[PDB]
Design an enzyme around this catalytic site. Structure first.
Site, PDB file in Angstrom:
ATOM      1  N   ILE D  81       0.848  -1.190   0.000  1.00  0.00           N
ATOM      2  CA  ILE D  81       0.000   0.000   0.000  1.00  0.00           C
ATOM      3  C   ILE D  81       0.885   1.241   0.000  1.00  0.00           C
ATOM      4  CG2 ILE D  81      -1.887   1.258   1.193  1.00  0.00           C
ATOM      5  CD1 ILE D  81      -2.622  -1.616   0.192  1.00  0.00           C
ATOM      6  N   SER D  84       3.409   7.570   2.670  1.00  0.00           N
ATOM      7  CA  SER D  84       3.766   8.976   2.500  1.00  0.00           C
ATOM      8  C   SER D  84       5.077   9.153   1.734  1.00  0.00           C
ATOM      9  CB  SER D  84       3.868   9.662   3.858  1.00  0.00           C
ATOM     10  OG  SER D  84       2.647   9.564   4.566  1.00  0.00           O
ATOM     11  N   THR D  85       5.982   8.183   1.876  1.00  0.00           N
ATOM     12  CA  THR D  85       7.305   8.259   1.255  1.00  0.00           C
ATOM     13  C   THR D  85       7.349   7.497  -0.067  1.00  0.00           C
ATOM     14  OG1 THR D  85       8.415   6.306   2.233  1.00  0.00           O
ATOM     15  CG2 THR D  85       8.259   8.289   3.604  1.00  0.00           C
ATOM     16  N   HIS D  87       9.019   4.783  -0.539  1.00  0.00           N
ATOM     17  CA  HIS D  87       9.251   3.374  -0.216  1.00  0.00           C
ATOM     18  C   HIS D  87       8.399   2.423  -1.060  1.00  0.00           C
ATOM     19  CE1 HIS D  87       9.004  -0.352   2.300  1.00  0.00           C
ATOM     20  NE2 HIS D  87      10.301  -0.117   2.399  1.00  0.00           N
ATOM     21  N   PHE D 112       2.904 -13.874 -10.222  1.00  0.00           N
ATOM     22  CA  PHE D 112       2.914 -12.579  -9.554  1.00  0.00           C
ATOM     23  C   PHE D 112       1.695 -12.404  -8.661  1.00  0.00           C
ATOM     24  CE2 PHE D 112       2.570  -7.843  -9.485  1.00  0.00           C
ATOM     25  CZ  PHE D 112       3.787  -7.588  -8.861  1.00  0.00           C
ATOM     26  N   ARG D 126      -9.576  -6.434  -3.900  1.00  0.00           N
ATOM     27  CA  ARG D 126      -8.833  -7.363  -4.743  1.00  0.00           C
ATOM     28  C   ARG D 126      -8.436  -8.634  -3.990  1.00  0.00           C
ATOM     29  NH1 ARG D 126      -9.161  -2.562  -6.079  1.00  0.00           N
ATOM     30  NH2 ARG D 126      -9.112  -1.869  -8.264  1.00  0.00           N
TER      31      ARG D 126
END
Lengths: 153, 153, 153, 153, 153
Positions: D81, D84-85, D87, D112, D126
């Site tokens: 998910i 804020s960064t 990452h 995958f 999902r």
């Protein structure tokens, strides 16, 4: 400074956006001639699109070897214009990376001759097709090919 | 901490944005000498553009070996300013990945000396060309080359 | 759940953003010791920046083999904050990809200890430096290293 | 449609966003059983985060070979998910590329099973956790694993 | 013009967005037969999604070799539509890069037959399903396959 008379240079170009491609090829050819590269030693071959440039380059290099006429450098030439989908982004990305890696796999300089533009005007300007604006980038690619095949000998 | 008196460092640089290039190269040379690297052992060579840096580095490293003066580390230097097309993005992306990968292929430290800026002012500031702003990134690269070629002996 | 008493863990960290770097290292060191990893078996070494992390890790691993004290896993630690140019983007991208690949090239777990933030505060918060906000990501990297070196024996 | 009664399938899942992970695995397991894969031949294993999925998959595959119980396919499951960064972007990028490359390096199908979402709501939908919205993607992954292991024998 | 009478071309297509997939395949099959490729020498095979296209292609190429009916070129076909999450971005990126690399891994032309669209209408238009709008991109891929497998001996 650089002598191209002993070199054989391959130009592999796509056929999508042919008008702009032709102008780029001509510039590359022109600069090659000015560096002393012989006419019989400028080899031009085509592929359908820019995606076929990397593998086309490998097959082109290999065929030239089999012919006893090996290439000292290759200039893959393509024009990609940003459309409506993300096709532009993914072709540019993969092509640029493979052509880069192709320097090492082939063992000869592979000069990045792919234009990656947002408009048709942008590609035309960088092909020298708009008068009084910028220059033909094909010419730079011709000079780069001779130098990279020569400098480190 | 790190002594480079027994090291031979190579600097390969692009020729686009020459004013900003010259400042970074000089900063790398200046710092190299501060770590004890001799002037005879700082080898400077050029390629046309940043795309030519990775394979140019390879041909440069292999040339020095054949000369019997092998490089202990290499600093590829280029300057890329965002233009009007996507040319900036794909050159940056492909060049960076290959320079990174080149550490392992060449078996010597490859120091990332490519500026990837949005304005001319940003590249000048990171080459120490703005009187009060920031510093010359060229110096950091010189220090990196000495450390990376020595630390793990 | 994971006994780390018989393990030797390497920590390679960059030196830029040192205050945040130190805290992440401290967290990794703390959690390592909590899983039983002895202090004598935690080897800390530094590199200038995050770009030198991938190749530094290989040189570090090779050095530890030559010393007869092989590492069972490695945690490359870097702090990258978004600046004004695209430097952040290209360092992050190529660094992340190489660290990922390094797992397979080195044959030991390489734990991704690189912060990729937009502000200093974000890095500080993810290093456990902000009083009541989030936690030190370093600890998680410590736990990961021990598990990855043990679970699949 | 495809017979999985002679297949051994491994499922490797991350431990972040566990509620959603468990739902994705349960879907994969359920669909595996529908194709004839036996409970004994469905091997579940965990790693901390998505970055550990690629190498953890290799270690998982190798351990199963040493146990004399090799895998015919693997389903690396992660939930990522956006925070804020940056990452998110860099973990997603290198994990997806490596899992793709892992198909060719392991010699078995790698399916995958990483969700790359902007919100928690999206990952839940999902995973089949929302009542009147979409389906569990985990089921599709179980179907894919069976097919890719059998279709080309 | 190119003679495809002696060629065997494979088409591997994903199954999601079937309506668009089928139009692209029909377009490619059509152009193949125009270049003289016999219908017994056009092999259609399927995989679940676009992520399976690269490894499926290898499994397909190797299967055909075992059968004594090898492929001279392959056209992996897929349709990717931008959704709510970042799933689209990461499937396109890794698939595109791998299909590109696959040219060199398999030693046969791998024609990029993946649409990367933002909307359904964009994919429909590029599949020839909207009258008077653009063309069926499938037809180009057929032509590309025949040219790339023949042009260089």
């Amino acid at each position: 400074k650089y002598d191209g008379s002993k070199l054989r240079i391959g130009i592999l170009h796509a056929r999508w956006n042919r008008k702009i491609i032709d102008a780029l090829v001509a510039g590359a050819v022109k600069r090659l001639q000015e560096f002393g590269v012989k006419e019989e030693n400028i080899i031009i071959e085509t592929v359908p699109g820019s995606f076929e440039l990397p593998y086309g380059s490998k097959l082109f290099v290999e065929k030239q070897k089999r012919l006893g006429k090996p290439l000292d450098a290759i200039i893959p030439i393509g024009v990609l214009i940003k459309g409506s989908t993300m096709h532009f982004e993914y072709i540019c990305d993969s092509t640029t990376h493979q052509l880069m890696k192709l320097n090492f796999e082939l063992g000869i300089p592979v000069i990045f001759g792919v234009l990656t533009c947002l408009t048709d005007e942008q590609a035309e300007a960088r092909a020298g097709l708009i008068e009084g604006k910028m220059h033909n980038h094909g010419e730079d690619w011709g000079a780069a090919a001779v130098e990279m095949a020569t400098k480190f000998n």
